[PDB]
Amino acid sequence: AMFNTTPINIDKWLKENEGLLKPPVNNYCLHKGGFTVMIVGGPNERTDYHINPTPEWFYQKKGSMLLKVVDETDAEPKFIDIIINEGDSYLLPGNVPHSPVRFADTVGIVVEQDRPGGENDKIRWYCSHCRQVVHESELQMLDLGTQVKEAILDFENDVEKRTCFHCKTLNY
Amino acid sequence: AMFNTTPINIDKWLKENEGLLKPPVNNYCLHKGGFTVMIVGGPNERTDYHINPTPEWFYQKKGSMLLKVVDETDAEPKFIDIIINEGDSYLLPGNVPHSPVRFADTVGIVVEQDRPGGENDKIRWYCSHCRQVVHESELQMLDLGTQVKEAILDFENDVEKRTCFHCKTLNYARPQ
Numbered sequence: 027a028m029f030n031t032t033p034i035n036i037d038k039w040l041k042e043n044e045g046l047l048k049p050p051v052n053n054y055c056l057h058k059g060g061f062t063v064m065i066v067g068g069p070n071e072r073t074d075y076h077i078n079p080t081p082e083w084f085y086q087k088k089g090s091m092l093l094k095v096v097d098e099t100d101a102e103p104k105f106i107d108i109i110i111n112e113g114d115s116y117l118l119p120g121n122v123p124h125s126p127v128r129f130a131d132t133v134g135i136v137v138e139q140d141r142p143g144g145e146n147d148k149i150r151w152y153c154s155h156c157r158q159v160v161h162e163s164e165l166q167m168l169d170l171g172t173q174v175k176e177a178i179l180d181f182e183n184d185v186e187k188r189t190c191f192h193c194k195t196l197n198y
Numbered sequence: 199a200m201f202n203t204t205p206i207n208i209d210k211w212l213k214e215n216e217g218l219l220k221p222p223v224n225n226y227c228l229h230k231g232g233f234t235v236m237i238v239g240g241p242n243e244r245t246d247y248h249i250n251p252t253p254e255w256f257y258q259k260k261g262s263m264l265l266k267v268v269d270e271t272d273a274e275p276k277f278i279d280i281i282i283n284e285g286d287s288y289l290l291p292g293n294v295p296h297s298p299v300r301f302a303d304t305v306g307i308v309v310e311q312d313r314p315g316g317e318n319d320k321i322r323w324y325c326s327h328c329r330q331v332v333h334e335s336e337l338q339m340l341d342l343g344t345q346v347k348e349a350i351l352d353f354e355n356d357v358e359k360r361t362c363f364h365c366k367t368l369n370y371a372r373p374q
């Protein structure tokens with residue numbers, strides 16, 4: 027029933043563990059329980075969009091990142107690139123689909139909060155040609171991380187899944 | 199963007215707004231809504247310990263801080279000072295009595311989440327002499343952060359709440 031009282035120095039953690047940052051997500055959990063505190067490297071290797079019913083906080087300790095987001099507040103979508111430079115703080119709200127584009131030799135922090143009872147995450151792809159939803163997978167509420175891996179992998183393998191229903195483009 | 203799509207450079211924000219971080223209001227709120235993301239300078243201390251039904255994440259951008267916690271896991275309490283050095287990340291779990299000590303020209307980030315609605319925040323004072331609980335107050339849900347300075351003032355101005363029942367030590371809301 028005892029809890030950790032030992033802080034972790036990011037620089038030192040990085041000096042020792044930066045190799046633990048592995049594709050296609052490049053993340054590791056520094057702390058868990060109530061919040062998940064991730065440290066993320068690059069370059070990451072994905073085109074998928076995360077939908078998380080809770081908010082997400084990004085801070086770039088080193089280098090810059092690209093947070094592609096979709097604004098769905100109004101009748102039709104807005105596809106926006108949010109450049110988060112070194113030293114940049116940014117809080118993304120619940121339900122905003124987002125696709126972090128990460129580069130080599132960069133370090134970011136991502137804080138997430140645990141999800142309540144009935145709020146499933148989703149992983150979504152958009153068509154490079156027409157920008158309709160190509161494929162959407164709802165994630166089953168546990169071990170999110172190995173599910174966000176087995177969905178990309180299953181996407182990478184399923185050509186009928188990678189095919190836009192609308193314009194019929196095969197999404198690379 | 200009916201939400202913010204504009205990140206904040208903390209270094210540039212600091213050059214611009216360093217004075218916001220001065221006492222008595224040493225915390226500035228960079229982002230709100232689901233998470234409350236604060237940037238916090240010093241010096242700042244109070245005798246009180248906060249009890250958050252949810253976790254608090256600390257990160258020291260510049261300089262170190264002192265996070266005093268009570269571990270209530272066993273029969274006797276354990277009063278631990280967690281030193282959070284520059285560049286340190288630390289997750290504090292829910293329901294851990296805690297009391298942040300911040301020092302002059304330091305910079306911190308704190309991240310907290312908006313509470314469920316059925317478990318309140320508490321504010322608590324331990325005797326400086328015998329470390330027995332001297333006073334505790336439950337905080338209201340709807341009124342966030344303003345019920346705090348109201349509870350410190352109330353503690354400050356009531357001597358019998360300020361007095362330890364056990365050793366009779368006159369306690370304070372702040373050092374000296």
Ligand code: NI
Nearest residue numbers: 076078082124
């Ligand atoms: Ni996400």
Ligand code: NI
Nearest residue numbers: 153156190193
């Ligand atoms: Ni298409």
Ligand code: NI
Nearest residue numbers: 248250254296
């Ligand atoms: Ni607190």
Ligand code: NI
Nearest residue numbers: 325328362365
């Ligand atoms: Ni006492």
